[PDB]
mmCIF file of all heavy atoms in Angstrom:
data_model
loop_
_atom_site.group_PDB
_atom_site.id
_atom_site.type_symbol
_atom_site.label_atom_id
_atom_site.label_comp_id
_atom_site.label_asym_id
_atom_site.label_seq_id
_atom_site.Cartn_x
_atom_site.Cartn_y
_atom_site.Cartn_z
ATOM 1 N N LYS A 331 99.213 104.947 98.000
ATOM 2 C CA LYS A 331 99.153 105.949 96.941
ATOM 3 C C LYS A 331 98.425 107.230 97.356
ATOM 4 O O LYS A 331 98.869 108.331 97.030
ATOM 5 C CB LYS A 331 98.500 105.336 95.698
ATOM 6 C CG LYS A 331 98.617 106.180 94.447
ATOM 7 C CD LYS A 331 98.534 105.339 93.182
ATOM 8 C CE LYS A 331 99.655 104.317 93.115
ATOM 9 N NZ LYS A 331 99.644 103.583 91.819
ATOM 10 N N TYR A 332 97.314 107.091 98.071
ATOM 11 C CA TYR A 332 96.607 108.260 98.590
ATOM 12 C C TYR A 332 96.298 108.099 100.073
ATOM 13 O O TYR A 332 95.437 107.305 100.455
ATOM 14 C CB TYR A 332 95.306 108.510 97.823
ATOM 15 C CG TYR A 332 95.477 108.880 96.366
ATOM 16 C CD1 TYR A 332 95.429 107.907 95.374
ATOM 17 C CD2 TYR A 332 95.666 110.203 95.981
ATOM 18 C CE1 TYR A 332 95.576 108.236 94.039
ATOM 19 C CE2 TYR A 332 95.815 110.542 94.646
ATOM 20 C CZ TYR A 332 95.769 109.553 93.678
ATOM 21 O OH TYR A 332 95.918 109.879 92.346
ATOM 22 N N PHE A 333 97.005 108.847 100.908
ATOM 23 C CA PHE A 333 96.690 108.879 102.329
ATOM 24 C C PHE A 333 96.219 110.278 102.708
ATOM 25 O O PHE A 333 96.710 111.283 102.183
ATOM 26 C CB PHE A 333 97.889 108.448 103.183
ATOM 27 C CG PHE A 333 99.134 109.247 102.939
ATOM 28 C CD1 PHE A 333 99.414 110.364 103.704
ATOM 29 C CD2 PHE A 333 100.027 108.875 101.948
ATOM 30 C CE1 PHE A 333 100.558 111.104 103.482
ATOM 31 C CE2 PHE A 333 101.172 109.610 101.718
ATOM 32 C CZ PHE A 333 101.439 110.726 102.486
ATOM 33 N N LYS A 334 95.259 110.325 103.625
ATOM 34 C CA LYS A 334 94.506 111.541 103.912
ATOM 35 C C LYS A 334 95.270 112.558 104.754
ATOM 36 O O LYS A 334 95.342 113.736 104.397
ATOM 37 C CB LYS A 334 93.196 111.176 104.615
ATOM 38 C CG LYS A 334 92.311 112.365 104.960
ATOM 39 C CD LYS A 334 91.018 111.927 105.628
ATOM 40 C CE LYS A 334 90.090 113.111 105.829
ATOM 41 N NZ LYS A 334 88.762 112.702 106.370
ATOM 42 N N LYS A 335 95.825 112.103 105.874
ATOM 43 C CA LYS A 335 96.522 112.983 106.808
ATOM 44 C C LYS A 335 97.779 113.596 106.195
ATOM 45 O O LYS A 335 98.043 113.456 104.998
ATOM 46 C CB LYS A 335 96.899 112.220 108.079
ATOM 47 C CG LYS A 335 95.742 111.523 108.773
ATOM 48 C CD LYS A 335 96.250 110.571 109.851
ATOM 49 C CE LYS A 335 97.228 109.553 109.270
ATOM 50 N NZ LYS A 335 97.714 108.566 110.276
ATOM 51 N N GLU A 336 98.561 114.271 107.027
ATOM 52 C CA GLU A 336 99.813 114.857 106.571
ATOM 53 C C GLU A 336 100.834 113.760 106.271
ATOM 54 O O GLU A 336 101.524 113.809 105.254
ATOM 55 C CB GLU A 336 100.363 115.827 107.619
ATOM 56 C CG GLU A 336 101.318 116.870 107.057
ATOM 57 C CD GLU A 336 100.624 117.854 106.135
ATOM 58 O OE1 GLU A 336 99.432 118.144 106.366
ATOM 59 O OE2 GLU A 336 101.267 118.335 105.177
ATOM 60 N N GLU A 337 100.915 112.768 107.156
ATOM 61 C CA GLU A 337 101.890 111.690 107.023
ATOM 62 C C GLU A 337 101.277 110.304 107.193
ATOM 63 O O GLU A 337 100.211 110.155 107.788
ATOM 64 C CB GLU A 337 103.017 111.865 108.039
ATOM 65 C CG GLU A 337 102.603 111.596 109.471
ATOM 66 C CD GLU A 337 101.854 112.762 110.090
ATOM 67 O OE1 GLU A 337 101.579 113.740 109.362
ATOM 68 O OE2 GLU A 337 101.536 112.699 111.300
ATOM 69 N N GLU A 338 101.971 109.292 106.678
ATOM 70 C CA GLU A 338 101.506 107.910 106.783
ATOM 71 C C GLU A 338 102.674 106.928 106.908
ATOM 72 O O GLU A 338 103.767 107.178 106.394
ATOM 73 C CB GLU A 338 100.636 107.549 105.575
ATOM 74 C CG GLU A 338 99.879 106.237 105.722
ATOM 75 C CD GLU A 338 99.201 106.109 107.074
ATOM 76 O OE1 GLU A 338 98.363 106.974 107.411
ATOM 77 O OE2 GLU A 338 99.519 105.151 107.805
ATOM 78 N N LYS A 339 102.442 105.818 107.601
ATOM 79 C CA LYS A 339 103.461 104.787 107.767
ATOM 80 C C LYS A 339 103.850 104.181 106.419
ATOM 81 O O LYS A 339 103.012 104.047 105.526
ATOM 82 C CB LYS A 339 102.966 103.687 108.713
ATOM 83 C CG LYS A 339 102.603 104.172 110.110
ATOM 84 C CD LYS A 339 102.083 103.031 110.971
ATOM 85 C CE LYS A 339 101.556 103.532 112.308
ATOM 86 N NZ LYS A 339 101.191 102.405 113.214
ATOM 87 N N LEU A 340 105.124 103.826 106.267
ATOM 88 C CA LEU A 340 105.584 103.190 105.037
ATOM 89 C C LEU A 340 105.288 101.700 105.069
ATOM 90 O O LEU A 340 105.270 101.084 106.138
ATOM 91 C CB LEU A 340 107.073 103.436 104.818
ATOM 92 C CG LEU A 340 107.397 104.829 104.285
ATOM 93 C CD1 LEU A 340 108.888 105.103 104.353
ATOM 94 C CD2 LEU A 340 106.886 104.978 102.862
ATOM 95 N N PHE A 341 105.060 101.136 103.886
ATOM 96 C CA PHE A 341 104.609 99.755 103.740
ATOM 97 C C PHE A 341 105.715 98.888 103.149
ATOM 98 O O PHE A 341 106.013 98.966 101.956
ATOM 99 C CB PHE A 341 103.353 99.711 102.863
ATOM 100 C CG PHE A 341 102.759 98.337 102.689
ATOM 101 C CD1 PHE A 341 102.060 97.732 103.716
ATOM 102 C CD2 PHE A 341 102.870 97.668 101.477
ATOM 103 C CE1 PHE A 341 101.502 96.479 103.543
ATOM 104 C CE2 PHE A 341 102.311 96.416 101.301
ATOM 105 C CZ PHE A 341 101.630 95.821 102.334
ATOM 106 N N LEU A 342 106.326 98.073 104.002
ATOM 107 C CA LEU A 342 107.416 97.197 103.594
ATOM 108 C C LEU A 342 106.849 95.848 103.170
ATOM 109 O O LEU A 342 106.086 95.239 103.920
ATOM 110 C CB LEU A 342 108.424 97.028 104.737
ATOM 111 C CG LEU A 342 109.536 98.068 104.946
ATOM 112 C CD1 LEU A 342 109.017 99.500 104.968
ATOM 113 C CD2 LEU A 342 110.299 97.767 106.227
ATOM 114 N N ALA A 343 107.211 95.375 101.978
ATOM 115 C CA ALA A 343 106.593 94.148 101.473
ATOM 116 C C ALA A 343 107.361 93.524 100.320
ATOM 117 O O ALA A 343 108.117 94.223 99.643
ATOM 118 C CB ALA A 343 105.166 94.440 101.039
ATOM 119 N N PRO A 344 107.170 92.208 100.092
ATOM 120 C CA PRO A 344 107.762 91.521 98.937
ATOM 121 C C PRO A 344 107.594 92.296 97.635
ATOM 122 O O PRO A 344 106.648 93.071 97.495
ATOM 123 C CB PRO A 344 106.992 90.204 98.892
ATOM 124 C CG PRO A 344 106.683 89.942 100.308
ATOM 125 C CD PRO A 344 106.439 91.263 100.956
ATOM 126 N N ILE A 345 108.520 92.104 96.704
ATOM 127 C CA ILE A 345 108.514 92.882 95.471
ATOM 128 C C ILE A 345 107.353 92.502 94.552
ATOM 129 O O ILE A 345 107.236 91.350 94.127
ATOM 130 C CB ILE A 345 109.830 92.722 94.695
ATOM 131 C CG1 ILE A 345 111.029 93.005 95.601
ATOM 132 C CG2 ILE A 345 109.840 93.662 93.515
ATOM 133 C CD1 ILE A 345 112.331 93.118 94.857
ATOM 134 N N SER A 346 106.502 93.476 94.244
ATOM 135 C CA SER A 346 105.373 93.249 93.346
ATOM 136 C C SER A 346 105.109 94.458 92.456
ATOM 137 O O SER A 346 105.403 95.591 92.840
ATOM 138 C CB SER A 346 104.113 92.907 94.145
ATOM 139 O OG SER A 346 103.689 94.015 94.921
ATOM 140 N N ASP A 347 104.566 94.212 91.264
ATOM 141 C CA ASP A 347 104.123 95.293 90.386
ATOM 142 C C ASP A 347 102.685 95.641 90.761
ATOM 143 O O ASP A 347 101.733 95.172 90.142
ATOM 144 C CB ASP A 347 104.260 94.910 88.894
ATOM 145 C CG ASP A 347 103.898 96.049 87.939
ATOM 146 O OD1 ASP A 347 103.557 97.151 88.418
ATOM 147 O OD2 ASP A 347 103.962 95.836 86.707
ATOM 148 N N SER A 348 102.534 96.466 91.792
ATOM 149 C CA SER A 348 101.212 96.716 92.363
ATOM 150 C C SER A 348 100.544 97.985 91.864
ATOM 151 O O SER A 348 101.165 98.815 91.207
ATOM 152 C CB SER A 348 101.288 96.776 93.885
ATOM 153 O OG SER A 348 99.984 96.847 94.434
ATOM 154 N N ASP A 349 99.265 98.123 92.201
ATOM 155 C CA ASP A 349 98.441 99.218 91.710
ATOM 156 C C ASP A 349 98.187 100.242 92.808
ATOM 157 O O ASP A 349 97.994 101.425 92.536
ATOM 158 C CB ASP A 349 97.109 98.681 91.173
ATOM 159 C CG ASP A 349 96.526 99.550 90.077
ATOM 160 O OD1 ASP A 349 97.036 100.672 89.872
ATOM 161 O OD2 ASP A 349 95.557 99.112 89.420
ATOM 162 N N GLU A 350 98.193 99.777 94.053
ATOM 163 C CA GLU A 350 97.840 100.628 95.183
ATOM 164 C C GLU A 350 99.020 101.428 95.711
ATOM 165 O O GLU A 350 98.854 102.262 96.601
ATOM 166 C CB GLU A 350 97.261 99.789 96.319
ATOM 167 C CG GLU A 350 96.409 98.627 95.855
ATOM 168 C CD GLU A 350 96.196 97.600 96.947
ATOM 169 O OE1 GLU A 350 96.064 97.998 98.127
ATOM 170 O OE2 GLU A 350 96.168 96.392 96.629
ATOM 171 N N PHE A 351 100.209 101.177 95.172
ATOM 172 C CA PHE A 351 101.420 101.760 95.738
ATOM 173 C C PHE A 351 102.312 102.452 94.718
ATOM 174 O O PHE A 351 102.243 102.176 93.518
ATOM 175 C CB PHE A 351 102.242 100.685 96.446
ATOM 176 C CG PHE A 351 101.465 99.869 97.435
ATOM 177 C CD1 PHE A 351 100.780 98.738 97.028
ATOM 178 C CD2 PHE A 351 101.436 100.221 98.773
ATOM 179 C CE1 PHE A 351 100.072 97.980 97.931
ATOM 180 C CE2 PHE A 351 100.729 99.466 99.682
ATOM 181 C CZ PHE A 351 100.045 98.343 99.261
ATOM 182 N N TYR A 352 103.146 103.361 95.215
ATOM 183 C CA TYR A 352 104.297 103.838 94.462
ATOM 184 C C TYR A 352 105.526 103.073 94.944
ATOM 185 O O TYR A 352 105.672 102.820 96.144
ATOM 186 C CB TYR A 352 104.511 105.340 94.644
ATOM 187 C CG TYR A 352 103.348 106.214 94.239
ATOM 188 C CD1 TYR A 352 102.683 106.991 95.179
ATOM 189 C CD2 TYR A 352 102.939 106.292 92.916
ATOM 190 C CE1 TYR A 352 101.630 107.807 94.816
ATOM 191 C CE2 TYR A 352 101.882 107.106 92.542
ATOM 192 C CZ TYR A 352 101.236 107.864 93.498
ATOM 193 O OH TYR A 352 100.181 108.674 93.139
ATOM 194 N N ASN A 353 106.406 102.701 94.023
ATOM 195 C CA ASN A 353 107.613 101.977 94.404
ATOM 196 C C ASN A 353 108.881 102.741 94.053
ATOM 197 O O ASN A 353 109.970 102.405 94.522
ATOM 198 C CB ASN A 353 107.638 100.594 93.750
ATOM 199 C CG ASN A 353 107.118 100.614 92.336
ATOM 200 O OD1 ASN A 353 106.749 101.666 91.815
ATOM 201 N ND2 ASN A 353 107.086 99.448 91.701
ATOM 202 N N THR A 354 108.728 103.787 93.251
ATOM 203 C CA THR A 354 109.866 104.536 92.738
ATOM 204 C C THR A 354 110.206 105.750 93.598
ATOM 205 O O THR A 354 109.333 106.541 93.951
ATOM 206 C CB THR A 354 109.605 104.996 91.294
ATOM 207 O OG1 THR A 354 109.419 103.846 90.458
ATOM 208 C CG2 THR A 354 110.768 105.816 90.768
ATOM 209 N N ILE A 355 111.488 105.884 93.924
ATOM 210 C CA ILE A 355 111.995 107.004 94.707
ATOM 211 C C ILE A 355 112.984 107.827 93.891
ATOM 212 O O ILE A 355 113.772 107.278 93.125
ATOM 213 C CB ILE A 355 112.685 106.517 95.996
ATOM 214 C CG1 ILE A 355 111.748 105.601 96.786
ATOM 215 C CG2 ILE A 355 113.144 107.688 96.844
ATOM 216 C CD1 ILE A 355 112.320 105.138 98.103
ATOM 217 N N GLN A 356 112.927 109.144 94.040
ATOM 218 C CA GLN A 356 113.928 110.028 93.461
ATOM 219 C C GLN A 356 114.816 110.540 94.586
ATOM 220 O O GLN A 356 114.329 111.107 95.567
ATOM 221 C CB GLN A 356 113.277 111.188 92.706
ATOM 222 C CG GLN A 356 114.263 112.127 92.032
ATOM 223 C CD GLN A 356 113.587 113.337 91.419
ATOM 224 O OE1 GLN A 356 113.295 114.314 92.108
ATOM 225 N NE2 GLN A 356 113.333 113.278 90.118
ATOM 226 N N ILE A 357 116.119 110.321 94.451
ATOM 227 C CA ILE A 357 117.048 110.629 95.526
ATOM 228 C C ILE A 357 117.676 112.015 95.334
ATOM 229 O O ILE A 357 118.185 112.347 94.263
ATOM 230 C CB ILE A 357 118.131 109.526 95.641
ATOM 231 C CG1 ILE A 357 119.028 109.768 96.859
ATOM 232 C CG2 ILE A 357 118.922 109.379 94.341
ATOM 233 C CD1 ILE A 357 119.809 108.539 97.288
ATOM 234 N N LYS A 358 117.613 112.827 96.386
ATOM 235 C CA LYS A 358 117.928 114.247 96.293
ATOM 236 C C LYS A 358 118.993 114.656 97.293
ATOM 237 O O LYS A 358 119.191 113.981 98.299
ATOM 238 C CB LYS A 358 116.670 115.087 96.536
ATOM 239 C CG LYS A 358 115.370 114.441 96.081
ATOM 240 C CD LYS A 358 115.045 114.801 94.649
ATOM 241 C CE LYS A 358 114.901 116.304 94.494
ATOM 242 N NZ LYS A 358 114.388 116.681 93.151
ATOM 243 N N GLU A 359 119.671 115.767 97.017
ATOM 244 C CA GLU A 359 120.546 116.397 98.004
ATOM 245 C C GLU A 359 120.223 117.883 98.072
ATOM 246 O O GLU A 359 120.913 118.705 97.467
ATOM 247 C CB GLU A 359 122.022 116.189 97.664
ATOM 248 C CG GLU A 359 122.966 116.514 98.813
ATOM 249 C CD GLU A 359 124.340 116.961 98.337
ATOM 250 O OE1 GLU A 359 124.474 118.139 97.940
ATOM 251 O OE2 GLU A 359 125.285 116.140 98.357
ATOM 252 N N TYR A 360 119.166 118.217 98.810
ATOM 253 C CA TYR A 360 118.653 119.587 98.875
ATOM 254 C C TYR A 360 119.646 120.561 99.503
ATOM 255 O O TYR A 360 119.508 121.777 99.360
ATOM 256 C CB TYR A 360 117.333 119.624 99.656
ATOM 257 C CG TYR A 360 116.165 118.986 98.935
ATOM 258 C CD1 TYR A 360 115.601 117.802 99.392
ATOM 259 C CD2 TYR A 360 115.622 119.575 97.801
ATOM 260 C CE1 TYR A 360 114.533 117.217 98.734
ATOM 261 C CE2 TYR A 360 114.556 119.000 97.137
ATOM 262 C CZ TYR A 360 114.015 117.822 97.606
ATOM 263 O OH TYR A 360 112.951 117.250 96.946
ATOM 264 N N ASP A 361 120.643 120.016 100.198
ATOM 265 C CA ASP A 361 121.662 120.810 100.873
ATOM 266 C C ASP A 361 122.631 121.453 99.876
ATOM 267 O O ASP A 361 123.057 120.818 98.909
ATOM 268 C CB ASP A 361 122.425 119.929 101.865
ATOM 269 C CG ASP A 361 123.181 120.728 102.905
ATOM 270 O OD1 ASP A 361 123.315 121.959 102.740
ATOM 271 O OD2 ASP A 361 123.651 120.116 103.890
ATOM 272 N N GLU A 362 122.971 122.717 100.114
ATOM 273 C CA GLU A 362 123.906 123.436 99.251
ATOM 274 C C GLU A 362 125.316 123.389 99.824
ATOM 275 O O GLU A 362 126.284 123.757 99.166
ATOM 276 C CB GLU A 362 123.466 124.889 99.066
ATOM 277 C CG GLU A 362 122.115 125.057 98.397
ATOM 278 C CD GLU A 362 121.703 126.512 98.265
ATOM 279 O OE1 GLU A 362 122.520 127.402 98.591
ATOM 280 O OE2 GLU A 362 120.558 126.765 97.836
ATOM 281 N N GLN A 363 125.420 122.942 101.065
ATOM 282 C CA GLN A 363 126.709 122.815 101.711
ATOM 283 C C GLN A 363 127.193 121.367 101.646
ATOM 284 O O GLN A 363 126.391 120.449 101.445
ATOM 285 C CB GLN A 363 126.620 123.303 103.159
ATOM 286 C CG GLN A 363 126.264 124.779 103.284
ATOM 287 C CD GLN A 363 127.295 125.691 102.644
ATOM 288 O OE1 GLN A 363 128.252 126.116 103.294
ATOM 289 N NE2 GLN A 363 127.103 126.004 101.366
ATOM 290 N N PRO A 364 128.515 121.160 101.777
ATOM 291 C CA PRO A 364 129.124 119.827 101.833
ATOM 292 C C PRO A 364 128.543 118.952 102.938
ATOM 293 O O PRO A 364 128.808 119.191 104.115
ATOM 294 C CB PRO A 364 130.592 120.137 102.099
ATOM 295 C CG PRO A 364 130.787 121.461 101.448
ATOM 296 C CD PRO A 364 129.534 122.218 101.689
ATOM 297 N N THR A 365 127.761 117.952 102.546
ATOM 298 C CA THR A 365 127.117 117.049 103.491
ATOM 299 C C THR A 365 127.183 115.612 102.976
ATOM 300 O O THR A 365 127.427 115.381 101.791
ATOM 301 C CB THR A 365 125.648 117.450 103.730
ATOM 302 O OG1 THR A 365 125.075 116.610 104.737
ATOM 303 C CG2 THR A 365 124.842 117.316 102.450
ATOM 304 N N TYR A 366 126.979 114.647 103.867
ATOM 305 C CA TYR A 366 126.929 113.246 103.461
ATOM 306 C C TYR A 366 125.498 112.732 103.472
ATOM 307 O O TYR A 366 125.252 111.540 103.276
ATOM 308 C CB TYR A 366 127.791 112.373 104.375
ATOM 309 C CG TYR A 366 129.272 112.628 104.258
ATOM 310 C CD1 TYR A 366 130.159 112.107 105.190
ATOM 311 C CD2 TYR A 366 129.787 113.384 103.214
ATOM 312 C CE1 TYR A 366 131.519 112.337 105.091
ATOM 313 C CE2 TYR A 366 131.144 113.621 103.108
ATOM 314 C CZ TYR A 366 132.005 113.094 104.050
ATOM 315 O OH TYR A 366 133.354 113.328 103.947
ATOM 316 N N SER A 367 124.558 113.638 103.713
ATOM 317 C CA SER A 367 123.152 113.271 103.786
ATOM 318 C C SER A 367 122.450 113.415 102.444
ATOM 319 O O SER A 367 122.808 114.259 101.617
ATOM 320 C CB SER A 367 122.427 114.116 104.836
ATOM 321 O OG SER A 367 122.635 113.605 106.138
ATOM 322 N N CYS A 368 121.446 112.569 102.245
ATOM 323 C CA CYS A 368 120.566 112.661 101.092
ATOM 324 C C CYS A 368 119.130 112.441 101.555
ATOM 325 O O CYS A 368 118.903 112.006 102.682
ATOM 326 C CB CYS A 368 120.956 111.639 100.032
ATOM 327 S SG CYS A 368 120.873 109.954 100.629
ATOM 328 N N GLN A 369 118.168 112.749 100.691
ATOM 329 C CA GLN A 369 116.753 112.626 101.038
ATOM 330 C C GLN A 369 116.001 111.841 99.974
ATOM 331 O O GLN A 369 116.403 111.807 98.810
ATOM 332 C CB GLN A 369 116.109 114.001 101.224
ATOM 333 C CG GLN A 369 116.836 114.911 102.199
ATOM 334 C CD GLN A 369 118.062 115.567 101.590
ATOM 335 O OE1 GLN A 369 118.201 115.638 100.368
ATOM 336 N NE2 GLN A 369 118.959 116.046 102.440
ATOM 337 N N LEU A 370 114.902 111.220 100.376
ATOM 338 C CA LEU A 370 114.173 110.334 99.478
ATOM 339 C C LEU A 370 112.777 110.867 99.154
ATOM 340 O O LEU A 370 111.932 111.005 100.041
ATOM 341 C CB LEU A 370 114.093 108.936 100.092
ATOM 342 C CG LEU A 370 115.467 108.340 100.413
ATOM 343 C CD1 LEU A 370 115.351 106.955 101.020
ATOM 344 C CD2 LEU A 370 116.317 108.301 99.159
ATOM 345 N N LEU A 371 112.543 111.160 97.877
ATOM 346 C CA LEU A 371 111.295 111.787 97.448
ATOM 347 C C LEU A 371 110.407 110.864 96.616
ATOM 348 O O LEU A 371 110.812 110.390 95.557
ATOM 349 C CB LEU A 371 111.595 113.056 96.650
ATOM 350 C CG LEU A 371 110.390 113.779 96.050
ATOM 351 C CD1 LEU A 371 109.438 114.243 97.147
ATOM 352 C CD2 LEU A 371 110.837 114.947 95.180
ATOM 353 N N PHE A 372 109.190 110.626 97.094
ATOM 354 C CA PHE A 372 108.210 109.850 96.346
ATOM 355 C C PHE A 372 107.475 110.726 95.329
ATOM 356 O O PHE A 372 106.860 111.736 95.693
ATOM 357 C CB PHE A 372 107.202 109.196 97.294
ATOM 358 C CG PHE A 372 107.555 107.786 97.694
ATOM 359 C CD1 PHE A 372 108.064 107.513 98.956
ATOM 360 C CD2 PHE A 372 107.347 106.727 96.819
ATOM 361 C CE1 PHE A 372 108.375 106.212 99.332
ATOM 362 C CE2 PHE A 372 107.656 105.426 97.190
ATOM 363 C CZ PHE A 372 108.170 105.170 98.448
ATOM 364 N N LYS A 373 107.541 110.338 94.056
ATOM 365 C CA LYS A 373 106.823 111.041 92.993
ATOM 366 C C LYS A 373 105.836 110.111 92.288
ATOM 367 O O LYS A 373 106.021 108.890 92.277
ATOM 368 C CB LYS A 373 107.801 111.635 91.974
ATOM 369 C CG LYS A 373 108.587 112.832 92.482
ATOM 370 C CD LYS A 373 109.594 113.327 91.450
ATOM 371 C CE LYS A 373 108.912 113.953 90.244
ATOM 372 N NZ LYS A 373 109.907 114.506 89.282
#
C-alpha cells in the first residue's frame, strides 16, 4: 500500500481481503491511436 521509492515489486499471493494491500486495478487505454495494448492502474 505504501512503498517509499519510485517503484516496488508486485506481491503475488492467495486471494485474501487484506489491509496492507490494494487488490483493485483500473484498466486503461491511454493511447489515442488504434492499438491492442492496455495499461493497469492501481488506485
Side-chain angles (χ1 to χ4, degrees):
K331 191 155 299 185
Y332 295 94
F333 56 92
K334 180 179 186 175
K335 306 169 304 182
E336 203 67 32
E337 71 281 5
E338 192 46 59
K339 301 178 187 187
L340 282 169
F341 183 74
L342 276 50
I345 308 191
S346 66
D347 184 1
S348 187
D349 209 349
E350 324 163 36
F351 309 87
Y352 302 116
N353 39 1
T354 299
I355 307 183
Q356 182 186 82
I357 186 162
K358 329 270 300 188
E359 194 208 79
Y360 290 111
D361 198 348
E362 298 179 6
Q363 297 298 270
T365 184
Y366 292 168
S367 279
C368 60
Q369 307 79 19
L370 303 180
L371 176 61
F372 266 105
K373 288 177 69 177

